[PDB]
Design an enzyme around this catalytic site. Structure first.
Site, PDB file in Angstrom:
ATOM      1  N   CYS A 227      -0.194   3.895   2.579  1.00  0.00           N
ATOM      2  CA  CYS A 227       0.327   3.582   3.857  1.00  0.00           C
ATOM      3  C   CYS A 227       1.563   3.830   3.781  1.00  0.00           C
ATOM      4  CB  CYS A 227       0.081   2.082   3.940  1.00  0.00           C
ATOM      5  SG  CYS A 227      -1.462   1.402   4.156  1.00  0.00           S
TER       6      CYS A 227
ATOM      7  N   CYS B 156       0.800  -1.213  -0.047  1.00  0.00           N
ATOM      8  CA  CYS B 156       0.072   0.016  -0.001  1.00  0.00           C
ATOM      9  C   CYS B 156       1.055   1.330   0.208  1.00  0.00           C
ATOM     10  CB  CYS B 156      -0.830   0.186   1.208  1.00  0.00           C
ATOM     11  SG  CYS B 156      -1.834   1.404   1.186  1.00  0.00           S
TER      12      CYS B 156
END
Length: 109
Positions: free
Chosen positions: A38, A35
């Site tokens: 993230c 991600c």
């Protein structure tokens, strides 16, 4: 003041229990290694942990703890959940830096 990576449900539960017991705000970063967003928020969350030694900062990789992610209905990455006295009290969906800081300060009292 450090982020605690919880690699098992047991690890997650013991830190969760510590926060409940001690009356501390717990902030969980539901994250994934795949991600992009993230990755971006990761160093910021680490910095919040240093700035707020009075709260507990947990990281949960959603592909490692699939059952914990499901239990929290995690449907976008990253998702930050705020826990107080055993219960969800707030959430931030996405790497919303300012929103995260605001809610930490407000919920900590």
């Amino acid at each position: 003041g450090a982020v605690i990576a919880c690699h098992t449900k047991q690890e997650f539960d013991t830190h969760m229990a510590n926060g409940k017991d001690t009356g501390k705000l717990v902030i969980i970063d539901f994250t994934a290694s795949w991600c992009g967003p993230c990755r971006v928020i990761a160093p910021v969350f680490a910095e919040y942990a240093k700035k707020f030694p009075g709260a507990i900062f947990l990281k949960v990789d959603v592909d490692e703890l699939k059952d914990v992610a499901e239990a929290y209905n995690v449907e976008a990455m990253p998702t930050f959940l705020f826990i107080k006295d055993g219960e969800k009290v707030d959430s931030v969906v996405g790497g919303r830096k300012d929103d995260i800081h605001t809610k930490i300060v407000a919920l900590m009292g």
